[PDB]
Design a protein around this ligand. Structure first.
Ligand SMILES: C[C@]1([C@@H]2C[C@H]2C(=O)Nc2cccc3cc(Cl)cnc23)N=C(N)OCC1(F)F
Ligand code: NA
Ligand code: NA
Length: 384
């Protein structure tokens, strides 16, 4: 409890390509890098020689593979994959010293799924069985882990973002506990509303302390989730409209093209001259543990302005605006998570946030987690 030195710094990534952990599958163990995804519930790995892949799961080499004689076709909004289901022995080398028999979807065909130039070959869906494909009878990895070992039913994530000049991203996934070296101040917990996605309820939104004053149901239409497998902070369309109006206003001392705010074009500045100060902070108040009690998390432009390094057309420091409109509810992606140490306390059906010891900031502002606040009618903020 509280100290897991073997798991610190077990995440790696490249800016724009997500955060992955080393895993092994099969006997003898085959090493793969696997994207950590709290927004899905399947363990799915490349199993055929797709040209984008560094390596792939070769079931024929594993003496412990067991075929489930069942396939799955998984379409996303953009892109898809098709796989064959089976079980095999799975371990996390820089994780708990255990090996479990887990479901594995061996990906045999995919479209717009793997990233050309990335260093990961599969995804680890850490959410609940309700959203597993093809149905909720396919036990997710973490459920198998907890069922088969003495690993406590919780994990925590510290995602450490980037800044010019481009160095790799990194962080820590603490499996079965919390490492108190990874955050400062106190953890504040918000309830997991329902165990499918890691669904939470946002009760108030501010831009530089200025309340959007929308009906709070709007903030969670049709859900709000914590998702390490999405870059952006995605906001419901109506909320995005209000938020971006407020952000434009706060930053009006400089004018940027309309397309910038829509993520249709980059903005660039001469190296080292990014005007962080003109951009507002963004605060989400989350439902607390106690009736009529909330707490607030606050992120900086350092989180929501993403550095884009691979721009052969330009010579400067270029950025993408990574708050975007949603039709799937609020998505608290890497833009939120990079500010915080996030504790997925499954045992107690709650998510903890604390200020990350690694988050990107400046001399004037830092990410924050603050409470308690008094917030009435928070139950009305959930969409039904
Ligand atoms: C299944 C799925 C795939 C696995 C997600 C994915 O590929 N994510 C990413 C792709 C590219 C750059 C990224 C950067 C960061 Cl920081 C995170 N994820 C990144 N999971 C979620 N949660 O939402 C999208 C999805 F398709 F449903
Ligand atoms: Na157990
Ligand atoms: Na601490």
């Amino acid at each position: 409890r509280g100290s897991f030195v073997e798991m610190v710094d077990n995440l790696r990534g490249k800016s724009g390509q997500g955060y992955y952990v080393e895993m092994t599958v099969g006997s003898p163990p085959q090493t793969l890098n696997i994207l950590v995804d709290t927004g899905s519930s399947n363990f799915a790995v490349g199993a055929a020689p797709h040209p984008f892949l560094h390596r792939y799961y070769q079931r024929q080499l594993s003496s412990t593979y067991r075929d489930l004689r069942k396939g799955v076709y998984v379409p996303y909004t953009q892109g898809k994959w098709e796989g064959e289901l089976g079980t095999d022995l799975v371990s996390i080398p820089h994780g708990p010293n255990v090996t479990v028999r887990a479901n594995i979807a061996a990906i045999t065909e995919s479209d717009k799924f793997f990233i050309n130039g990335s260093n990961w070959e599969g995804i680890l869906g850490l959410a609940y069985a309700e959203i597993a494909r093809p149905d909720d009878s396919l036990e997710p990895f973490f459920d198998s882990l907890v069922k088969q070992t003495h690993v406590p039913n919780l994990f925590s994530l510290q995602l450490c973002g980037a800044g010019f000049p481009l160095a790799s991203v990194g962080g820590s996934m603490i499996i079965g506990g919390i490492d108190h070296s990874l955050y400062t101040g106190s953890l504040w917990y918000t309830p997991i509303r329902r165990e499918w996605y890691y669904e939470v309820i946002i009760v108030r939104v501010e831009i530089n302390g200025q309340d959007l004053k929308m009906d709070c149901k709007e903030y969670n239409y049709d859900k709000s989730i914590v998702d390490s497998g999405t870059t952006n902070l995605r906001l419901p369309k109506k909320v995005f409209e209000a938020a971006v109006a407020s952000i434009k206003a706060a930053s009006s001392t400089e004018k940027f093209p309309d397309g910038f705010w829509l993520g249709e074009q980059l903005v660039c500045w001469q190296a080292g001259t990014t005007p962080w100060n003109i951009f507002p902070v963004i605060s989400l108040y989350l439902m607390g543990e106690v009736t009529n009690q909330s707490f607030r998390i606050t992120i900086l432009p350092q989180q929501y302005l993403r550095p884009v390094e691979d721009v052969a057309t330009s010579q400067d420091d270029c950025y993408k605006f990574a708050i975007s409109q949603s039709s799937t509810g609020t998505v608290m992606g890497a833009v939120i998570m990079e500010g915080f140490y996030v504790v997925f306390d499954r045992a107690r059906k709650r998510i903890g946030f604390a200020v990350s010891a690694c988050h990107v900031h400046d001399e004037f502002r830092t990410a924050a987690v603050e409470g308690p606040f008094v917030t009435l009618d928070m139950e009305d903020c959930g969409y039904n």
